[PDB]
Homo-oligomer: 95 residues x 4
């Protein structure tokens, strides 16, 4: 399960890297803002402080969302159940 | 399962087409912006760079969301599990 | 199952009514905008074209979200599986 | 199950407290606005009336979202099924 976590973890980083590079290049964001934006998009928060301005950015965002949501939310699920939950349970007992 | 994917795929395209046509017509968006907006609405991202301005657009958006979320997120589920997951698994093995 | 649908349906309408009344009264929105806003909040779209300006509105929105999301998304689930899915299946066959 | 509810309830309050303190301190929000913002972020509504302006706030928000969504939505699930549902069922019968 550490290896089920590791795979989704890696694939999430790669996905966020892809968005950082595209939005920094095509939409002209600073790298930190492109990552932030990629995260705010794929978790569906969508503040809108940043949003794509070019048609190439709009089209990319459509595809990035559909390809990216299932991965991101899979990782969050694995994180919650296989990492966060056990550590919570361990805290309720003194060794 | 390719035919379970195909049905949801088609129904998603039809749903996004419906929104593209309405928002381009009633809210005056360019077709590309209406599609983008329809996608950003039904995936619940909701940047708000675009939002309906007319009461007819507001009422439509209410119904489009309720009718459209269950479909869109069904497709994303099918996509993740029946397409993305297997291809990931295939990459971890050399033929 | 029509009666499992009917209950969630009614409870959803009541929930959206509650929000329409509060936001129209305390935040000064037109009734149509308060409903629209209530729907955009509880489905987690959150365009932000409307957002509460008063501390009383902010506090209410916190509680409305936590109480309201589980209901709204339950209805959408019931809608998709017990209404939308069967009708889709019926269309694929001529009577 | 009251103790399964109580744990997630407490962990949710602690999580929202953490965000209130950070955003009030680093991003300069009033405490009430920082709580409101933390809630609007972790439920994925994301109005964007508030959004982090500093790089330290942006980085924190990335991590807060990934750590916080699984908890928040777990609580909402427990709330809906173990608290809201039973009380609904009890109302349909006179004692
Ligand atoms: K969701
Ligand atoms: K959102
Ligand atoms: K927004
Ligand atoms: K906005
Ligand atoms: K949003
Ligand atoms: K959302």
């Amino acid at each position: 399960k550490d290896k089920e976590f590791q795979v989704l973890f890696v694939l999430t980083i790669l996905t966020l890297i892809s968005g950082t590079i595209f939005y920094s290049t095509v939409e002209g964001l600073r790298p930190i803002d492109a990552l932030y934006f990629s995260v705010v998009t794929l978790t569906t928060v969508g503040y809108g402080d940043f949003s794509p301005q070019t048609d190439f950015g709009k089209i990319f965002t459509i595809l990035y969302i559909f390809i990216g949501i299932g991965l991101v939310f899979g990782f969050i699920h694995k994180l919650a159940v296989n990492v966060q939950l056990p550590s919570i349970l361990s805290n309720l007992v003194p060794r």
